[PDB]
Write a protein that binds this ligand. Structure first.
Ligand SMILES: C/C=C(\C)CC/C=C(\C)CCC=C(C)C
Ligand SMILES: C/C=C(\C)CC/C=C(\C)CCC=C(C)C
Lengths: 273, 273
């Protein structure tokens, strides 16, 4: 993670020795994307908004996948054979605001791989941590309420990096988009409903597994798909729609929240105590 | 139902011939409560707020129950042996705002029997009918969206009477308090969450049965109570608390609402969508 300005010779060890030890063709492509992304950050800064940690390896992954989705049955072209400029247009195309059209499996793989976050994701994760006593555990990482709530403020950039570190261990990029969506749903449930508050630690993976398992069960009732622990169907389901991904997650979060005390709140005092 | 001013001689048929044909000792006690309630309405009008249809037979029932809860193991005194004034103090005591202390089975039996409604119950039932296309069915009655939405306005007194007629067939008074609570919960879920809207008719009895069955299952996991279809435990559970009645009902309503389209809403357009 180059978090601070570094020398050409330190940056070179990071690319040819410290990070890429399996394929060095990756270091040339990653060097190609830093040059392309750097001018894109300078002249078109907003093609990279909602991105705070630009994972060049993950952005290259989004590009290899875009070549496969674009490719169709015909074999996908090798990003490596593509010309420096063709690699820049692939990047510019993947960075383009995902529009109505692509499979929601492709939208998720690109957004998750680019690590794009809905606006206010970081502020919304603060609001989830403020109303959760024991913290959020995602992919074996844990944002505990303290020392973060005590040492940080809502819009602190340091927090955005802690949220990004917490979601660091999410290996699969489409899972990062579902975890980013559970967190966006948990923020709407918590904000829309001010009475509910988490008792134990929120395991974002378990809320996602529970949502997929409900989807698995409901889709099974439609047509009994026999693929198991394959979330491809779940990822393709649109976020909002008749039975979309956002329903399953809201349900899971609400079952967890409702298993705990409902604090009587004064903003809209109950008409029933 | 005496909805309009009537003569002493018409009121007399209503009490000794038309309504009480099984025990006429009931007509003397009901006559006793109209005299007591009538001065209470005149001088202390708010001991009867949240009450629009004063069911004297149901209010006498609340009083016979208060004598049993007050009685303890020792046999409950016969309301009929009680002196006219002792019957007025029993009434004044049952009408007193239920305070923190009594079993939530007793709070419910008194409130349900007095037909007390949380403030704005009637306005909140309009809001449930406005966002439910095919209406609410309770105890074999149905508040359909039309002709009521078309012919009535939110604060119309005519609507309060239609809501009270719909909840008319609820024989058991504690069930009326749970149905009044499901309706209060459905109003908080619908209001807090503006995107969710009911697809089919809301059967308030089915939402209550599904909440009791979840409670039955969870309490069974604690201690396996063998009483079946006995809602006494559910009624005693406090409305809001660690696992209270309001959680089960919110859950049931949310499962029904989330089984339908989530209308994308513009007040807080989706950030992750
Ligand atoms: C962009 C995402 C949303 C607009 C959230 C959709 C809302 C729900 C699935 C129900 C939320 C319910 C609560 C009680 C908070
Ligand atoms: C007097 C009653 C209440 C204060 C309602 C309690 C709230 C819930 C049980 C959760 C509601 C959730 C929504 C998304 C509307």
């Amino acid at each position: 993670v180059i978090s601070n300005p570094l020398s050409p010779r330190v940056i070179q060890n990071i690319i040819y020795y410290k990070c890429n030890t399996h394929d060095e063709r990756e270091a040339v492509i990653q060097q190609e994307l830093v040059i392309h992304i750097g001018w894109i950050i300078s002249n078109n800064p907003e093609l990279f908004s909602g991105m705070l940690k630009i994972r060049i390896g993950w952005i290259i992954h989004a590009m290899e996948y875009e070549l496969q989705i674009r490719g169709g049955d015909k074999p996908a072209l090798d990003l490596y054979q593509l010309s420096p400029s063709e690699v820049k247009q692939l990047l510019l195309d993947i960075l383009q605001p995902q529009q109505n059209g692509r499979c929601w499996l492709n939208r998720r793989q690109i957004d998750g791989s680019l690590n794009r976050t809905p606006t206010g994701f970081y502020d919304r994760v603060w609001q989830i941590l403020e109303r959760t006593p024991n913290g959020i555990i995602v992919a074996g990482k844990h944002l505990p309420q303290q020392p973060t709530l005590s040492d940080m403020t809502m819009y602190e950039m340091n927090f955005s990096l802690l949220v990004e570190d917490t979601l660091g261990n999410i290996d699969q990029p489409q899972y990062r988009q579902i975890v980013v969506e559970l967190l966006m749903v948990v923020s709407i449930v918590l904000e829309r409903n001010p009475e509910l508050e988490f008792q134990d630690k929120v395991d974002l993976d378990r809320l996602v597994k529970e949502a997929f398992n409900e989807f698995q069960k409901d889709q099974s009732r439609l047509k009994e798909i026999e693929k198991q622990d394959d979330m491809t169907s779940f990822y393709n389901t649109p976020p909002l729609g008749k039975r979309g991904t956002c329903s399953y997650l809201t349900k899971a979060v609400m079952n967890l929240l409702l298993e705990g005390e409902v604090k009587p709140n004064n903003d809209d005092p109950c008409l029933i105590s």
